[PDB]
C-alpha cells in the first residue's frame, strides 16, 4: 500500500511534467546496489539481483512487471487530485 | 474557320512567347454550339521558360485568323488560367500515392544480389578500373585538391562536408559513378550496402581479395576489394575496427535521424552517422576510408554513400507523409543555389548529367533528374506509416540527449561518450561508457562549423545507472584521433545535455495513462473475493 502511494506520486509527477522515473534529488545514492538484494548470497532471485540498484526500480511496471488496479486516490482521479492539492496550497497553512 | 494562336505576355519586360495554337471547326451553316467546359492546354513549359511565377502576371494575349489569313477581331475570352498541383504532393487533395517518375536504374540491397548480378557488377567496375576512369571520378572527392576560393588564397579539397548541402554533393557523386558503371555494361545500378543490420563478416562483394571468374574459369582479383591510388603510387587498405561488427546502435541512430522535421538537423545527424562507417572501416591506415583525403579511392565509398543516400531518400518520403517540404529546403537557403565545385567545373567533369544538375536544388528529385530509384523505401521492413508510427511512440517518452557543437578539426577522429556520477563524499568523477560518434576530415579540407548541436540519446544508459534528468551527473567525452596512439585535449565545448519531456507528457502528447509490460495486477484488499 505504501508502495502504491509512491506509484501515485510518480503519476502525479507525470501530470506536473516533472521527474517521475528519475530523481534529481539524491544523486550519489541512486547507483549503489541494495546491500541485501545485491549480495550473491543469499538473494538468488535473478530479477531482484539484476535490478538491485535504486535507479533500476523507479518504474515498477516495466521492470517488476506489475500494476495497481487503480492509481486514483480516495476515489479521486489524478487531475482532480492535483486540483485538491492546489486548492489546499491556496490557503494560509502552518507547520511544525 | 477560326485558327486561334495564343501567347503569354508579362507586364515587366514585356516578354511575349507563344504557347501553341488550336483549331476550332466552323461553317456558315452550323448547329449552334458553345462549350459548357473550357478547353485546356498545358502551357507549363512556356511559363517556366519566362521565369514567370504563376502568381504574378503573366496575362495572356491571343490572335485569330481565318483560312485566308485575314485577322478576325474581338473574338474570345481566354481569361481563366488554372494551376494543377502534382498528385504526388499529398498536401491538400489525393491520399498518399507513391507517385510515378522516370525511374530508371533501380538500386537494390547488396544482400539480395545473385551471382550473376555480382559478377557483372565486378566486371563492369573492373572495366572502369584498369582503364583510367574511376580514379578520375574519385579525384573529385579525394586529396588532389581542385578548389581555390574565394580569391583564392589557398586550395581545398572539393567535397562538401560541414554544410547542409553535404548530401546533395555526395548524392551526385554516386550518381556519376553509377552512370559510368552502367555505361560499362553493368546489369544493375549501384547497390546499397545496408550496415544498419549487424554483420558477423563484411559483405561478400567487397570483403574477399579474390573472386572466382566463371567465364574465364580462373580466379581473379576482386575490383571492389581495393582501389588504386596511382598519383601517390599507393593502394587503399582497410583496418576494420571491432566496433563495426555486430553493434545495433546504428538502428537507434538512424531512427533519431529520421525524427528530424527540419532539414539541417536531419543533415547534421545524418552526416555524423555517415562519418561513423568511414571511421570503423578504414580506421588506422593513412590511405583508407577513414581519412577524408583518400576515402573516395576505396570503391566501398559509393557502396557506402548510395546507402547513406537511400537513408536521405527515405527521409524525403517520410517528409512527404508529414506534408513538410521533401524536395525543397526551408533550411539554409544561400547554399542551395551554389553549384557543386567539382561538378560545375567544365574540367575535369565531362559528364553532362552531373554538370547540368550540379546546383543543390537540382539534386533534390533524384528519381526525375538523376533517373534512379531504390527498390523499397521501407526501413527495417517498415512501411512509412509504420515508421512514423514508431517515431511518434519514440517521442512518447521522456528523453535525455547529449549535445555536441562540432566543427572542422584538421583531421578525422572518434569522440566517445562517458557518464560521470559524482560520489557523495568526496568529489569524484567520470568513468562509465555511454556512446561513440565520428568526425571526418583531412589536412586541406575546407573549414566548417555546424550552426546547431548534434544530439546523442543517452536515455537508456542513464536508465541502467538508475539516473534521471534531475539526478546529479555530468557528461564527458574522450577524443581519440585517427592515429591509434593519438588522444586529444579539449577541442570541442563540453557536451550539453538536453531533456525533452514526453508528448512523457512533457511537450506534445496529452496525458495518456501509458501502456507497459504490466503483468500481475495488484488490487485493494477490501475488493478481494
Amino acid at each position: 500500500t505504501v508502495d502504491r502511494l509512491w506509484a501515485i506520486w510518480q503519476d502525479l509527477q507525470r501530470y506536473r511534467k516533472l521527474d517521475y522515473n528519475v530523481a534529481n534529488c539524491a544523486l550519489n545514492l541512486l547507483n549503489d546496489p541494495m546491500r541485501p538484494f545485491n549480495n550473491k548470497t543469499a538473494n538468488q532471485d535473478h530479477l531482484t539481483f539484476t535490478n538491485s540498484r535504486p535507479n533500476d526500480v523507479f518504474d515498477y511496471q516495466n521492470s517488476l512487471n506489475y500494476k495497481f488496479d487503480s492509481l486514483s486516490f480516495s476515489g479521486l482521479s489524478i487531475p482532480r487530485l492535483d486540483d485538491l492539492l492546489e486548492s489546499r496550497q491556496s490557503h494560509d497553512r502552518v507547520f511544525a | 474557320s477560326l485558327l486561334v494562336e495564343y501567347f503569354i505576355a508579362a507586364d515587366g519586360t514585356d516578354q511575349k512567347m507563344k504557347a501553341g495554337e488550336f483549331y476550332v471547326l466552323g461553317s456558315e451553316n452550323e448547329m449552334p454550339w458553345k462549350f459548357d467546359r473550357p478547353y485546356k492546354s498545358d502551357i507549363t513549359y512556356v511559363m517556366d521558360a519566362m521565369k514567370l511565377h504563376y502568381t504574378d502576371k503573366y496575362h495572356v494575349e491571343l490572335r485569330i485568323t481565318d483560312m485566308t489569313g485575314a485577322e478576325v477581331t474581338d473574338l474570345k475570352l481566354v481569361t481563366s488560367v488554372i494551376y494543377e498541383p502534382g498528385i504526388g504532393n499529398f498536401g491538400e487533395g489525393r491520399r498518399w500515392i507513391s507517385p510515378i517518375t522516370s525511374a530508371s536504374r533501380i538500386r537494390k540491397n547488396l544482400l539480395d544480389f545473385e551471382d550473376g548480378e555480382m559478377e557483372s557488377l565486378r566486371n563492369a567496375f573492373k572495366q572502369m578500373a584498369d582503364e583510367g576512369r574511376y580514379e578520375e571520378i574519385a579525384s573529385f572527392h579525394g586529396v588532389p585538391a581542385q578548389c581555390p576560393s574565394e580569391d583564392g588564397t589557398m586550395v581545398h579539397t572539393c567535397c562538401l562536408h560541414g554544410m547542409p548541402v553535404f548530401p546533395h554533393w555526395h548524392r551526385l557523386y554516386v550518381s556519376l559513378v553509377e552512370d559510368e558503371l552502367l555505361a560499362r555494361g553493368s546489369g544493375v545500378a549501384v547497390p546499397y550496402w545496408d550496415w544498419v543490420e549487424p554483420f558477423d563478416e563484411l559483405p561478400r562483394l567487397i570483403n574477399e581479395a579474390t573472386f572466382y571468374n566463371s567465364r574465364t574459369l580462373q580466379i581473379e582479383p576482386n575490383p571492389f576489394f581495393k582501389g588504386k591510388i596511382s598519383f601517390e603510387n599507393a593502394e587503399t587498405d582497410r583496418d576494420t575496427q571491432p566496433e563495426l561488427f555486430g553493434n545495433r546502435y546504428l538502428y537507434d541512430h538512424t531512427l533519431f535521424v529520421f525524427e528530424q522535421t527540419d532539414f539541417c538537423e536531419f543533415e547534421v545527424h545524418y552526416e555524423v552517422l555517415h562519418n561513423t562507417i568511414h571511421s570503423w572501416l578504414g580506421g588506422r591506415d593513412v590511405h583508407s576510408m577513414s581519412s577524408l583525403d583518400y576515402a573516395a579511392y576505396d570503391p566501398v565509398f559509393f557502396l557506402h554513400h548510395s546507402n547513406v543516400d537511400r537513408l536521405w531518400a527515405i527521409w524525403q518520403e517520410l517528409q512527404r507523409y508529414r506534408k513538410l517540404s521533401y524536395n525543397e529546403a526551408n533550411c539554409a537557403l544561400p547554399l542551395m543555389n551554389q553549384p557543386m565545385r567539382p561538378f560545375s567545373n567544365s574540367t575535369a567533369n565531362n559528364d553532362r548529367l552531373t554538370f547540368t544538375n550540379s546546383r543543390p536544388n537540382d539534386v533534390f528529385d533524384y528519381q526525375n533528374v538523376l533517373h534512379y530509384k531504390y527498390d523499397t523505401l521501407n526501413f527495417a521492413g517498415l512501411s512509412i506509416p509504420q515508421l512514423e508510427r514508431i517515431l511518434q511512440k519514440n517521442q512518447g517518452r521522456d528523453r535525455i540527449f547529449a549535445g555536441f557543437l562540432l566543427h572542422g578539426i584538421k583531421a578525422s577522429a572518434d569522440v566517445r561518450i562517458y557518464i560521470c556520477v559524482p560520489t557523495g563524499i568526496g568529489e569524484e568523477n567520470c568513468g562509465n561508457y555511454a556512446g561513440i560518434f565520428s568526425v571526418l576530415g583531412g589536412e586541406t579540407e575546407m573549414p566548417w562549423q555546424f550552426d546547431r548541436l548534434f544530439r546523442y540519446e543517452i536515455t537508456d544508459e542513464l536508465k541502467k545507472l538508475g539516473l534521471n534528468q534531475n539526478s546529479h551527473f555530468r557528461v564527458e567525452m574522450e577524443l581519440t584521433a585517427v592515429n591509434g596512439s593519438k588522444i586529444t585535449q579539449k577541442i570541442f565545448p563540453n557536451p550539453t545535455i538536453i531533456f525533452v519531456p514526453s508528448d512523457v507528457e512533457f511537450e506534445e502528447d496529452t496525458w495518456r495513462d501509458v501502456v507497459t509490460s504490466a503483468n500481475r495486477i495488484r488490487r485493494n484488499l477490501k475488493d478481494l473475493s
Partner: protein
Amino acid sequence: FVPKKVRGNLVRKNVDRLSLQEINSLIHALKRMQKDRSSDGFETIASFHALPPLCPNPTAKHRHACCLHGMATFPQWHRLYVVQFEHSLNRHGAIVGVPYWDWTYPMTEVPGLLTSEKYTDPFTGIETFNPFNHGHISFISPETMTTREVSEHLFEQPALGKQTWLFNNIILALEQTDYCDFEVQFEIVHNSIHSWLGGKELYSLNHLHYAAYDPAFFLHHSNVDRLWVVWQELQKFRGLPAYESNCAIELMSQPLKPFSFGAPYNLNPVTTKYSKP
C-alpha cells in the same frame, strides 16, 4: 508559516504611460464619437452632465439638472458617468479604458494629449486636429468651443517642509473612515482641478454647465474614480465596509439620472441596469 498561494476588463492607464498605438486608437475613437451625432456621440453624452438639462424628466417645464454634486451620491453618479463615456469609445474603437492623470503626483505640465493642439499619427504620417485639446458646444453655435485657463497653483512643488495642496487634502480625504465625511472632503478636493484648468473662461471646466464638453473633464474624472477606488481599497484594508455605505443610505436607493431613463435617451443597457448608486 506558508502564506496563501467573458470579455476582459478595460484597463485605465496613466496618460503618460500610454503607448503610441494606444494614443492612436484613443485619438481616432474620440474623433469618431466626436463626429458621431448619435446618442453614443460626444455631444449627447456631454449633454447628460448639465447644460442641455434632462432632469427630473427631459419633458419638464422647468428642469433642475442633472448630475449629482454636493451630496453623498456624487461619486457614484460620476463613476457611472465615466463608464458611459468609456463604453462609447470602447465601441468607437479605443483599445484601452479612459486614461487618467493623477494629481497624486506633483505636476509641472498638463499631459501631452490634453494640451497639444495637433496630433500626428506615426503610422500614416498625416497631421490632424487633436480631439482631446478642446470640445465643441454644438447647440449654442457650430463655432463655439471650450476654452481653458491654467492657474499657477496647478504646478505647486513640495518646499522644504511644505507639500502641495493636493497631496495634503487628498490624504486628508483618505484619512476619513466614514463614507460621508470622505465624500464631503473628496468632492472639494475634486473641485480644485476644475477651478485650476477652468479659470475665468466661461465655456470651461470651472463652469458646471459646460465642463463635460471639454474632453479633459473625463480624463480628470477617471482619476477621480481611481481616488474613490483607492479609498475603497483602504477601507477593505481596515476591515471596514467598501462596496457599501452605512451613512446616507436613503440616497443610495434613488436611481442615477439620466441613466435611469432607459428609454430613447440612454441605453447602454449596463448603464441603465445599474442606475441605483
